[PDB]
Amino acid sequence: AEKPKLHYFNGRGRMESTRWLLAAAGVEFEEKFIKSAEDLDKLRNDGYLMFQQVPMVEIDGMKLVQTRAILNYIASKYNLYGKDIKERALIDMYIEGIADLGEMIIMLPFCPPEEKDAKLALIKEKIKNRYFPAFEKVLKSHGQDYLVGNKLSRADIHLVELLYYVEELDSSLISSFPLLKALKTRISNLPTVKKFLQPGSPRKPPPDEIYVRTVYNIF
Amino acid sequence: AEKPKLHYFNGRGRMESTRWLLAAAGVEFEEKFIKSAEDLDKLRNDGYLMFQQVPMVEIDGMKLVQTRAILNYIASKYNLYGKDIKERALIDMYIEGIADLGEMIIMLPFCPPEEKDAKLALIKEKIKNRYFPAFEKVLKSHGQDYLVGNKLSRADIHLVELLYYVEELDSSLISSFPLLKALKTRISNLPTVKKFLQPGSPRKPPPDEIYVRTVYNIFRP
Ligand SMILES: N[C@@H](CCC(=O)N[C@@H](CS)C(=O)NCC(=O)O)C(=O)O
């Protein structure tokens, strides 16, 4: 078999978590960037997209769509999904909270400018009161260097990803949560993640104005 | 050792597909309904809602929140998650597309009326042009009775659940999809699912105005 092939726009969006997880697992992938509406419609009409939507990853003979199908498979494959049914329950419970928060961040740049002050402030509120307290509590309780099973899981990789986006948004939000600060540091220093955080990697930048309207020219 | 306890409002929403799956799996459950803002608070203050939200299921000594956490567990436990990593991948693909549609049907009754007509037209368009052809194509591709690995999985239950809501919405949308209709009939006749489709089961009605205001009252009275 070949290297996993990521089909998306050249930008973060719904593919970035998969990029983080593959790189976290030491897997070399390639990207075929959708540059235009035509690029997408070609994928659609060639029957590559089960639901007419990207992200799409060609991996192990399959054309997998839907971000969570993609991510589960990778996590399962590279032993990043715990060791039994209960660890998975915990892992799922966590990564789904992270995906609800991350969903608001991914959408933020698209809602109209008059609603931005309000939608951001509600994210900061939920970060401060809901999600970060949630995850600090987990770390405080068992005292261990990883969210689940006392070893690296996709939850870890998904949270740390989200802590870089929360840093980009407001660097003080994490200030009251020392366990999340240390988590970020340890995970960022894992040889595979460290290489992914360095310049030149497939890691994608935040959305700028160009990114938004380029996105509108493809959706 | 006790029955799983499902903690949610008395209605469909985000608990319904867990009710389907549990029943499909032959597992009897109890429900504790959230009637008030106080009922929600008691759960939160007990420290039982990890993200201050329901659905929550009490099951095998855990308190599971997050729909996808709940469904996954029940699917693995009761062998409804395929047999290997590859089957899981297709099942997940199929059901996450069902989930994306399901989500829209779940939010529609809380849309403002300014946006309702367009949102409903979109849901149907998406059923006609995106989803029903997606699954029709998968069932034609291998001619088998089940979506994945020629045996009953969660993907068959979640889809056929969806087929019942789409029927309510507009009963004509399935008519040009012979294989879906056939799948709906077979799965409906499996003994566990037949018991659940029968009158007087925990299967819940479509959301009415009383449900719609009960829910608004619980987050903002
Ligand atoms: N993604 C979550 C959605 C859960 C959710 O939003 N639940 C609502 C009612 S359906 C809730 O309890 N909201 C409380 C809040 O947001 O404060 C899941 O799958 O469980």
Q: Is B8 annotated as a binding residue?
A: yes
Question: Please, are residues B53 and B43 in contact by the beta-carbon 8 Å criterion?
Answer: no
Query: Ligand 1: which of B7, B9, B14, B57 to mutate, judged by most atoms within 8 Å of the beta carbon?
Result: B14
Report the C-alpha gap between A108 and A214 in whole angstroms: 16
* Interchain contact, A66 vs B93, CB within 8 Å: yes
- Report the CATH number at residue B154: 1.20.1050.10
User: Do A87 and A183 belong to one domain?
Assistant: yes
Enclosing H/E stretch for B22: helix B16-24
A202 and A175 within one domain = no
Which residues in A lie closer than 8 A to residue B62 (C-beta atoms)? Answer: 86, 89
How many Cβ atoms sit within 10 Å of the Cβ of residue A37? 12
Q: Phi and psi of B30, rounded to 5°?
A: -110, 160
Q: Across the strands, what pairs with A59?
A: A62
Does one domain contain both A124 and A169? yes
H helix or E strand, kind and range, residue B64: strand B62-65
Q: Helix, strand or coil for residue B135?
A: helix
Structure tokens at B116: 């309702």
Are residues A22 and A107 located together in one domain of the fold?
A: no
Find the B207 Cα to ligand 1 centroid distance in Å.
Answer: 17
Closest Cα of chain B to A135: distance in Å?
9
For ligand 1, say whether the CB of B188 is within 6 Å of any of its atoms: no
Boundaries of domain holding A19: 1-80+190-219
C-alpha A160/C-alpha A6 separation (Å) is 21
Give chain A's domain count.
2
Q: Do B98 and B139 share a structural domain?
A: yes
Range B212-219, long-range pairs (CB < 8 A, 24+ positions): B212/B109, B212/B110, B214/B9, B214/B10, B214/B11, B214/B35, B215/B9, B215/B11, B215/B13, B215/B110, B216/B110, B217/B36, B217/B37, B218/B9, B218/B34, B218/B35, B218/B36, B218/B37, B218/B39, B218/B40, B219/B37, B219/B40
End-to-end CA distance of chain A: 31
**B134–A64: do the CB atoms touch at under 8 Å?**
no
Whether residues B72 and B91 share a domain: the answer is no
Do B182 and B97 belong together in one domain? Answer: yes
Q: B96: exposed, middle or buried (C-beta count within 10 Å: 0-12, 13-18, 19+)?
A: buried
Phi and psi dihedrals of A63, rounded to 5?
Answer: -110, 90
Residue A76: list chain B partners with CB under 8 A. Answer: 85, 88
User: What residues contact residue B207 under an 8 Å CB cut-off, 6+ apart?
Assistant: B11, B12, B13, B109
**In chain A, which residue's Cα lies nearest the Cα of B77?**
A85
CB A65 within 8 A of CB A50: yes
**Chain B interface test: which of A96, A148, A162 (most B C-beta within 10 Å):** A96
Q: What secondary structure, in 3-state letters, does A59-126 show? A: ECCEEEECHHHHHHHHHHHCCCCCCCHHHHHHHHHHHHHHHHHHHHHHHHHHCCHHHHHHHHHHHHHH
Contact A17, A68 (CB under 8 A): no
Q: Please name the residue that has the structure tokens 């980009």.
A: A168
Instruction: State the Cα–Cα distance between residues B67 and B21, nearest whole angstrom.
Output: 12
Dist. CA B134–CA B208, nearest whole Å:
30
Q: Find the chain A residues whose C-beta atoms sit closer than 8 A to any C-beta of B.
A: 50-52, 60, 62, 64-69, 72-73, 76-77, 85-86, 88-89, 92-93, 96-97, 100, 130-131, 134
- Which of B69, B86, B97 minimises the CB distance to A89? B69
Same domain, B89 and B147: yes
Return the biggest CA–CA distance within chain B: 52
Same domain, A91 and A133: yes
- Provide the 8-state DSSP code for A174: G
Interacting residues of B166 by C-beta distance below 8 A, sequence separation 6+: B127, B132, B173, B174
Both B173 and B87 in one domain: the answer is yes
- The Cα–Cα gap between B108 and B119 comes to 7
In terms of Cβ atoms closer than 10 Å to its own Cβ (0-12, 13-18, 19+), residue A57 is buried
Distances (CA, A) of A198 to A23, A98, A189, A203: 12, 24, 11, 9
Query: What residue type is B102 in one-letter code?
Result: G
> In B, which residues are within 8 Å of A67 by CB distance?
96
Q: List the CATH number of the domain containing B43.
A: 3.40.30.10
Nearest-10 crossing angle of helices B67-77, B16-24: 0
Q: What is the resolution of this structure in A?
A: 2.4
Angle formed at CA A157 by CA A3 and CA B54, multiple of 5 degrees: 120
Tell me how far apart the alpha carbons of residues A73 and A171 are, in angstroms, rounded to a whole number.
33
Contact at CB, A69 and B85, closer than 8 angstroms: no
Whether the upstream peptide bond of residue B206 has omega within 30° of 0, thus cis, is: no
